[PDB]
Symmetry: C7
Amino acid sequence: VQRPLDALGNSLNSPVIIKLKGDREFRGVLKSFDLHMNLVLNDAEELEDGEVTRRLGTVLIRGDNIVYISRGK
Amino acid sequence: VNVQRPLDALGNSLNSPVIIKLKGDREFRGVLKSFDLHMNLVLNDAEELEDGEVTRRLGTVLIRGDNIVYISRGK
Amino acid sequence: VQRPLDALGNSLNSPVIIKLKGDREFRGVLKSFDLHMNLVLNDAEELEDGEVTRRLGTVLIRGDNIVYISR
Amino acid sequence: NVQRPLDALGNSLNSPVIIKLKGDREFRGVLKSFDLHMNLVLNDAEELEDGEVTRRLGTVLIRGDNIVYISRGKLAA
Amino acid sequence: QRPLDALGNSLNSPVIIKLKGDREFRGVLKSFDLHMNLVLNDAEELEDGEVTRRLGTVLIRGDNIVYISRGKLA
Amino acid sequence: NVQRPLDALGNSLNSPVIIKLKGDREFRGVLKSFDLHMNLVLNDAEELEDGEVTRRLGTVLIRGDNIVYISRG
Amino acid sequence: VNVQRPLDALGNSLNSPVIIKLKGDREFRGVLKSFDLHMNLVLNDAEELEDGEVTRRLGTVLIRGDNIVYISRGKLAA
């Protein structure tokens, strides 16, 4: 869609890359999000330095910690 | 959960064990008892972990949302 | 049914542990708090790593620095 | 009042207080006024860093956003 | 007139985004909101002048943004 | 007035003040204006350091969010 | 000056060179073109400096007010 949050909806049910502050990263399937960018991923993995360090299954990430969001696979 | 209501995932986790990761990496594991829209929450039979291990048994604890990075129903 | 701030009401006049950002900790009796979690402890003690480093008497702690509150 | 922590401050108006700040600086002085954000004014204030007085400020306005806690100060020994 | 209008005139232009902590992105500005959240197309994340990652479309939260620049040519 | 600390600022208009910021940066100058966020303007501002000017700035607008304290002196 | 409108000091600086000091040793210099109540502002012919030396030529740039410590006037070339 148009504005950033409206567009983010196009990613629902798709794999995404969530880059967090502190140079942490999560990958998983986007299932929900609000206008604060709080969001839920399914089948999520936390990566660090490039390696998967934890399997977080379903996870709710607080938007305040997010740096950027991009398409994964 | 509703595509526009991410906090419903907390509702779906009431009474289930959860993992809470905070800024600065402190982590807490406990049974989720309640929460609010700021993601403040109350856990029972809670434990605090540091560097991959349990460092403190807290019992019931209210955790302020503003310091939370994520909440996981884990595996 | 009790959201956090409401649940906190049950600790009123009872001893609590307050952990702050930067690892400082306070112990005392919860006398009051508001919605921002600003709160007052009576007979408060400031602990660092293990023992008391300061006896405060009645202290008002700003909620913004709080990481967690427990019994 | 269990819903009014700021009443604690009210009881301290015109008495010596200790204001502990983020970064661990500390101010001591007489509380003259404060608002709901905990911005406040002290008269006869001293600024302490690493244990000692580093400055005498006279009257000072401290922004609440930097405060960690406030307690009562002691009278001279 | 207002800063937000300059963003509006940058739609479809290449931009340089510098974040707090110094992460940098360069890409084509596609959209933005009043909080300065932005979407860039054909983005590259850079560290010290070298592309660290090719992102394709990316949504950058405005709260971490230090500046958004239209840069210089060549 | 025990409910309006900002009045202490009101009382310092057109008088020299010392401004202490997060990070320990210090400024001195004549207070000319301020708002409820404590954003303020100083004329003849000088950045100071351990009681020693290190930069003469002229008129300056300081963002309130970085202020630790303001004293009349 | 309007004792209650400190942002007017910016109004007076529109189309003039300014110095934008950020959260530690970093500053930008450029000609102020616009600003809002959050202190977000736009500069033209701008530069980013570190340690007093030009690090990057920023052209027209929007700087977010949340990172600004202070704003003062810049100078014309010697």
